[PDB]
Amino acid sequence: ANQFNSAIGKIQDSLSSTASALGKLQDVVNQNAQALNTLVKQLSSNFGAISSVLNDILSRLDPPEAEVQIDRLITGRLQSLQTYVTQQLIRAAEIRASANLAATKMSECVLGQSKRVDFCGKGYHLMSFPQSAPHGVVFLHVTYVPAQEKNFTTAPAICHDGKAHFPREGVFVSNGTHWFVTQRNFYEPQIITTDNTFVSGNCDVVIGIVNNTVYDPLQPELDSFKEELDKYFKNHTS
Amino acid sequence: SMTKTSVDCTMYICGDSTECSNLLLQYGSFCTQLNRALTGIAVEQDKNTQEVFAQVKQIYKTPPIKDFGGFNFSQILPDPSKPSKRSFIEDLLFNKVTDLICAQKFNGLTVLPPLLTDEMIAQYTSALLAGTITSGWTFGAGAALQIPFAMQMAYRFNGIGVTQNVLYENQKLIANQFNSAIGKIQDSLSSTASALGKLQDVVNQNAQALNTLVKQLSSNFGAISSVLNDILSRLDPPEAEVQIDRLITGRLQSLQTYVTQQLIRAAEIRASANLAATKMSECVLGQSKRVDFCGKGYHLMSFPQSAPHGVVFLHVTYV
Amino acid sequence: TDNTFVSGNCDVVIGIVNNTVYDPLQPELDSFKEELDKYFKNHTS
Amino acid sequence: SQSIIAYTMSLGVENSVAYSNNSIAIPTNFTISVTTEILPV
């Protein structure tokens, strides 16, 4: 509870203090601003003609001379307009590719839970929170990352009765005294039992197997009965 | 990544001409749009190297005493005894991919050097290789967890539905199957030089585009002569402005045609870079259950390798 | 019984076959019952 | 007394992870991290 609430507070502080994290969206505004400005500023260029003003060419030069100068003006503008449209088609292919990626993360990270690496963000993905953004969308990804680690002693299998005991879930760890079973994602030491392992093959086919005693939870409960039932059988004879 | 090129509008259209430079002012900002477009391509070429080659900011190293359980990584890992850091496979990957540079730089076509050198590319590869070997799947989702490599194959088999008992019994059989398969990779890349043709098409695409862009200068474009010194020394200044304008309009469309083609090829190379960045994270760092993504069969591990203007992935699958 | 689980009955499943499910507790307890028979004869002897 | 300096690109902190057959590392703790991604639409 204190880890998530403090992390959201860091997102609020990082978003309020740093305004450049949204520059990916500010680039979209800049690309459109530079494109809208370039198209209108080319109207003042002469485009190989005498003057860019169409009212000055028509009211001065003769009709045979005016049609030639205006032809250079119109053709030069069409090339500038086709250049604008061509640049818009290129930015259209880039914004649709980013939209397909946003629609993919919205489905896998937000709606469901994705196990993909470096897709929903660094670490094991847990939940994703979408947020509205101008000309875009912002994703808040909550992930699971480990913090503290410690080196342990391991072994591929446990040899008890002459057959290798492989861990059912987790791995084998030991501090140098007794062998424990714990998960890979977190350390929760447990006693080796028949329910935590399974018997496959023998002890010879395993390279690096160690010898230990697999605790049978039914062994003390059945032996306690052999003690009690013999005490009952002794009373049956008396 | 693709070859970074920067073309000056002035020297390509009309060089060493003051009268033509005044004629270019009538066409406005055409240099600004063509220069920023080619500049934006060169910037995106370096962004593809940061999103693909270097996944993490932590460099991982190989321990001096190597016991991997019978696998031989000497071919995939770089050789420290060589002057240039590379592996045995990357030695062929660099050699099978092929002055024209200085000749094109004389006409105003500048080849920009890449920000990320090939030696630093091999370090990012060796860092991801040494991390996949020692840390397994742990270094990608967080701090690197020390795990023996023999137990790393057990988890990778449990993910595809294979009980780890097959590993410990077939440990000697799997050792011979992997070492023999990696040996076939070096033998196939040495005999067949066309396996890298996907990268050779990128070099050929830049070579044909730069050469054709220069060949457009030899055309007169409906004028008397394609040489600038001829028009100035033959026709009067009032008559010369007409013939020079014919060379300007043609070479402007020829330069806009090259920029248009490069902006289209830039979208194709970024799409392949995003696919390489996705396979770098899912196949190499972690283990993906996706089909026909990390390679045919049930995926196990992925080994990246450095390649000119690209990256080579070595995929190990369970068939 | 540890490798399988009980769901439904034999009449609902289409294509079910008849066989014996080995329970590792049966021979351990049946032999334990034989020992109790031997233990009871030891207390009477 | 500051100026522009030139240097070779650093490739990141070099950390050699230990490796052994009988040694393993398991996390004793964890954390909950929140990240932000901005995708234009």
Residue numbers in the entry:
A (entry chain D): 924 to 1161
B (entry chain B): 730 to 827, 848 to 1068
C (entry chain B): 1117 to 1161
D (entry chain D): 689 to 729
What text does the study give?
The spike (S) glycoprotein of SARS-CoV-2 mediates receptor recognition and viral entry into cells. It forms homotrimers protruding from the virus surface and, once engaged with the host-cell receptor–human ACE2, undergoes a substantial structural rearrangement to fuse the viral membrane with the host-cell membrane. The S protein is also the primary target of the humoral immune response during infection. A large number of SARS-CoV-2 neutralizing monoclonal antibodies bind S protein, especially its receptor-binding domain (RBD), providing a basis for vaccine development.
We determined four cryo-EM maps of the Beta S trimer engaged with ACE2, including Beta S-ACE2-C1 (only RBD-1 up), S-ACE2-C2a (RBD-1 and RBD-2 up), S-ACE2-C2b (RBD-1 and RBD-3 up), and S-ACE2-C3 (all three RBDs up), at 4.0-, 3.7-, 3.6-, and 3.6-Å resolution, respectively. Overall, the pattern of these structures is similar to that observed in the Kappa S-ACE2 complex. In the S-ACE2-C2a, -C2b, and -C3 maps for both the Beta and the Kappa variants, the up RBD-2 or RBD-3 appear also to associate with ACE2 if we lower the map rendering threshold, indicating a dynamic on/off of ACE2 association with these RBDs, in line with our BLI data showing relatively rapid disassociation kinetics between ACE2 and the S trimers (koff = 1.00 × 10−2 s−1/9.34 × 10−3 s−1 for the Beta and Kappa S trimer, respectively). Similar to Kappa variant, ACE2 binding to Beta S also induces a pronounced S-trimer population shift, facilitating the transformation of the S-ACE2 complex to the more open C2a/C2b (64.0%) or fully open C3 (27.7%) states, beneficial for the shedding of S1 and subsequent transformation toward the postfusion state. In contrast, for Kappa and Beta S-ACE2 complexes, they all present pronounced population shift, i.e., with only 14.1% or 8.3% population in the one RBD-up C1 state while the remaining dominant population existing in the more RBM exposed C2a/C2b and C3 states with two or three RBDs up and possibly engaged with more ACE2s. Transformation to the fusion-prone C2a/C2b and C3 states can lead to loss of concealment for the S2 central helixes, which was offered by the RBDs resting above them, and decrease in S1/S2 interaction, facilitating the shedding of S1 and transformation to the postfusion state.
